[PDB]
Symmetry: D2
């Protein structure tokens, strides 16, 4: 069996909804991060064994979005590719599948991550194929239906967040305070240059002129305070506490890593950024999907033989302030080690990419701080979680 | 690393386009086959570690089709699930992923396979979200765009078949002969009860009355003859050889297997139906995607330590007669051992399920013949192939 | 000023929803009745001064449906045409506009009537032009929105019928009895050949074979009784009395007359079928639009100098049994003189044509019985009415 | 038979496509002009006998757009209303219908004109009702299909303009000169306050703030020059002369007049702005529909007993410079008396309102010039024309 290492890790800056990446299909964002990984390592494209990319919103995307990213990146036709959907966890579960293929010797080199363009997710017209017959019909927002709506309880992810606010007695004010601190940390990280190493610029075609470079996360909102956030109306339930300001946003982006066997990295003479110590999935009740990270984290820590207090750094994707605070209540983690450069409330949640986006952020901040142990974890719509651990010597 | 064994294998009958399963969402087809695997083995649903399902056409399907099948089958919320898309190969690649998880010790019990309802694939309206502005616009058939259209060359899978007919000099007459034999063999197998053991009936809700059981493959065309096939118009190109009669059809169905470690099967007292001896993916030129099975097959045989001559029985998915003939010409296999109960020209190509559909059909025929060594292989839109080997003592 | 006469009058048989005329656009139904009027009179097409046709549902119908009917009928490009919309009254109001043009000497010969294909009325997608942005959207049934829904009260025409059932204390049983008698009278008229003279057959193109003649009204339902009708659920309101069986149906058809000055008819040597004695419109509260015929009838009788009891025959379009019984309560007419060959509950309500359809039925039954005075009247969605009187010597 | 007089005349400013009126449904534009006519004359709303409004694009507009304008303007439910469609001529034909009703003694007071919101014309999905079956389908721009496309020849109104440019040998340079002059004249009229007396302001709801008044025509393009027009690409045919700069635009607006018998105006003490001396329609070849004004004008002059040389002032709607030049060549009129404040190339062509828009502009200019004899004329898609004459003492 082989040990699995990361030799390159990169992401796009994260675009806002109908923002800077709104014209660029998800597989072109994937292609741009694949090219960068090969540039950073000087790796011949022929050395890649597989491309594994998460993407949730694939209506009208064409055959196999992961194959589109691989071909558009200039990888030869001989490199196989697959797309996966574990909703919000897709981009991290891609690394789990790549690690598995490398551990059992099916591959030595894998590109793994995710890509999502929520801006470009289309409307869908069920029933037009066979006949609507009569009566007004529903033109379905595929982003909501396929990305943000619970298939079992017939309500938004935001109601799952209301459920956790109730269960843990989390107040509006606690949720707003968490949201403001995420904003403050993201703006400080951006201004402090903490995202420069991890970001691949996208050359965005303009209406007129040469392309403009997009290289700076654009979701964070200056001047976010508990006082401004207190004015917002509840977004999902009349007397609710979850708002657009303490929830993650809608976003565009891609993120990927170059996985290898430790043996292959050494044979190529590539420096190792981190080893993968463990990975895990878990399932929970869809009604409280935001708690998925608790069991996923405990399983990953158990598989690595670690205790939570040994983690130097944690990236716990911020689907909703209520969801994040609920995970922190259950795990009893030190919040000062969690999302130290800000989280998805400030930076965005480009669903199928977020799992790899938070992993890339974790890895670069671990290198900066000389951290030895880190965890990436995400909740998943439909009631699941993923977690993955990274180690450095 | 553990042997990976199959302890149960089942599929729906395959429905024709707007046929018997046209009202049943893909995940309900998946739920029905997962329920049957547990019934056949008497396994408690809590013993399942993961559900891995292929499904290509997911526009408006809701969050995580695989998770929807797992929950609807009565698996507990604790069982994680993921959907994958390797287009035509999705349903077989799912067993490769399940094999990897078991070989790494990440799981002991995996449900793997695929599900597709082409009848229900909707229309998509790109640009409606941001504004069509003016001018007539294209309402996109997601079944064609996401399932049947090459993303690189902007033409139908059927043109890839024409490309193979031209390259191998495969005549209209040889393609129609292959298609007639597929029909004759499938009809003989159905009438002979050859598919009874492998089929899970679906109770189809009726507008009026108690549900009707669907348990008989409905795509095969009785009294097909070469003389009748000779009269059809080319389906994809003016002077082409590929027709509706020598191409696969549009279909609905699901298929799944219950994978275990050899150790777990022994501890439960479950008989081993077959061992997975190897599996592989390959990439080829998208323009001739139908040839993907050649290198996928050669890699899977190399990984098993087997020669082609050692295979007793082969299931090679029939995307098009031209594609199936080309693969047979390159590999030089004995056609008498290939698709002995008919293939997809007769039985249908429910894209994301086909990979597991042909594996289920391979396994049941291997048992009746006392075959020791079997191969399942598929071409994949976008220029890929998958192959997997079965061994019996 | 000129006196206005009818020298020819004809209609299609009325098609059921997705019935025999479901493939034939409204202007082709109009063209077929225009051709017949000219055949019946031997009139040179160049003698027509104008074509005035009602059509309500014109979404995607192309420029000026009335001009399409005129050109398709073979009338020269020199004949002007206009389309009008007075909803349910369009096909009778067309005769009012033609009568006005003839009375004041603007024209000597006019084709007037209406045409509707409700089967072909399309779905409409508001907001797609400028952007739906996010959220599920409404795909609008144009037939409901433009034809059957009140623009002021935001409810169906059927609620206006519930309002009249309340106001006049009309029971479910009274409404069902009216519906059954309409069915019985329509079937007796069809079987007795009372519609043969007034109907122009349509040659309906088939999937395979030569066209099939459609010449027999297909909406009437044999075996309609108060006992069968008693089983139906209320169609518009939970504890309501209006059902699909005591309401008019959805239908396809066209109907037109050839109007002339009495002077022009005499100069051409054409026999006069009837003179137009008077015409009128009225407005009422949209909430009780079904009562529109009361004031419209009184104004038309006043303009002709007639009393209601002088009418030998009345065609009062049956939007809903409640609506019809309410009009009869207000006017105190002899019900034995109303809709003697059945009404719209049995024969259908092809909205934009119905006004001329009931006029053509009135005229032919007046000739059969040697009636001297007749009235055609219709209620109109949005709260209006039309009425027109016919005389014979 | 009574003289028909105009006692009030007003129009909205004309909005550009997705400009100031882009959020205001056509019938609300109509309501605003009807309210203004009553305010200007101090007429009680109960004195109106009918509302006759043109509107071409009615897909999803709801029952009877004219009735919606009448009710929203505060006319009592007793006032009947009808919508008409004579495409580009609808807004003028409405006054012809109103004139006829008054000449026959059917009415004493009619509101007549037209209304259009092209910005709000929706997309249509033919075939969704009965089933698209498979294959990419056409989402129809109803503005193009129902407003701008010839139903007989299957090409744009702009090709009818090319047909006239070829037939009359009208150069690109002569078309651009005509277009530049239309722009220069409209801008001079706006800046001079020439349209203040004829315009009813619309209070436009704003996302945030009190409504903003829209009272200034926004289609005209300041600093238009022949040198700038010379650079534009042909809009309809590869080597054509018709461009976006020498064609009318897409627009939103409404216009209406208050018509009375001479007797009724006298009895109310209302001054007569003008008398309608005559009106006419004509039909021509759809391929050269732009020439419709020639025979319509000749018929209207014949009916008034006037020669072309007696006209002081002409409004000839500018569908295209090529179309306007062709009409001028055939009639031989003095261009200095035509569209003296600019026309539709500059001011816009809100299809169903244009007929009344140009009549309102004619009447206000006739008053300032003390013109005695005026003509308004329009070409009509489908091969028609309308013309109407105004007299002042």
């Amino acid at each position: 069996m082989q040990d699995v290492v990361i030799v390159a890790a990169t992401r796009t800056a994260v675009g806002s909804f109908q923002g800077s990446l709104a014209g660029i299909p998800a597989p072109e964002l994937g292609a741009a991060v694949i090219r960068r990984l090969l540039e950073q390592t000087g790796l011949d494209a022929g050395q890649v064994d597989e491309v594994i990319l998460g993407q949730v919103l694939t209506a009208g995307s064409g055959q196999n979005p992961a194959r589109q990213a691989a071909i558009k990146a200039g990888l030869p036709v001989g490199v196989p590719a697959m797309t996966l959907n574990k909703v919000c966890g897709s981009g991290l579960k891609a690394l789990h599948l790549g690690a598995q293929a490398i551990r059992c010797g099916d591959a030595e080199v894998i590109v793994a991550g995710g890509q999502e363009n929520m801006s470009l997710a289309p409307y869908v017209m069920p029933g037009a194929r066979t006949g609507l017959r009569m009566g007004h019909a529903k033109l379905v927002d595929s982003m909501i239906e396929d990305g943000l709506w619970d298939a079992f309880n017939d309500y938004h992810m935001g109601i799952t967040a209301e459920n956790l606010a109730e269960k843990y007695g989390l107040t509006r004010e606690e949720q707003d305070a968490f949201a403001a601190a995420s904003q403050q940390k993201a703006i400080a990280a951006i201004e402090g240059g903490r995202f420069r190493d991890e970001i691949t610029p996208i050359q965005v075609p303009q209406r007129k002129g040469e392309p403009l470079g997009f290289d700076t996360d654009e979701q964070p909102r200056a001047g976010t305070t508990v006082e401004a956030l207190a004015k917002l109306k509840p977004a999902f339930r009349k007397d609710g506490s979850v708002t657009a300001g303490n929830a993650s946003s809608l976003n565009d982006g891609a993120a990927a890593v170059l996985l290898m066997s430790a043996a292959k990295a050494k044979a190529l003479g590539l420096p190792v950024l981190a080893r993968i110590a463990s990975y895990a999935s878990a399932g929970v009740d869809p009604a409280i999907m935001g708690i998925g990270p608790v069991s996923a984290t405990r399983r990953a820590l158990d598989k690595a033989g670690w205790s939570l207090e040994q983690l130097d750094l944690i990236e716990a994707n911020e689907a909703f302030a209520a969801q994040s605070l609920a995970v922190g209540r259950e795990l009893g983690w030190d919040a000062a080690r969690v999302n130290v450069n800000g989280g998805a409330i400030a930076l965005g949640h480009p669903i199928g990419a977020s799992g790899c986006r938070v992993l890339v952020t974790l890895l670069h901040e671990m290198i900066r701080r000389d951290a030895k142990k880190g965890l990436a974890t995400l909740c998943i719509g439909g009631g699941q979680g993923v977690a993955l651990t990274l180690a450095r010597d």
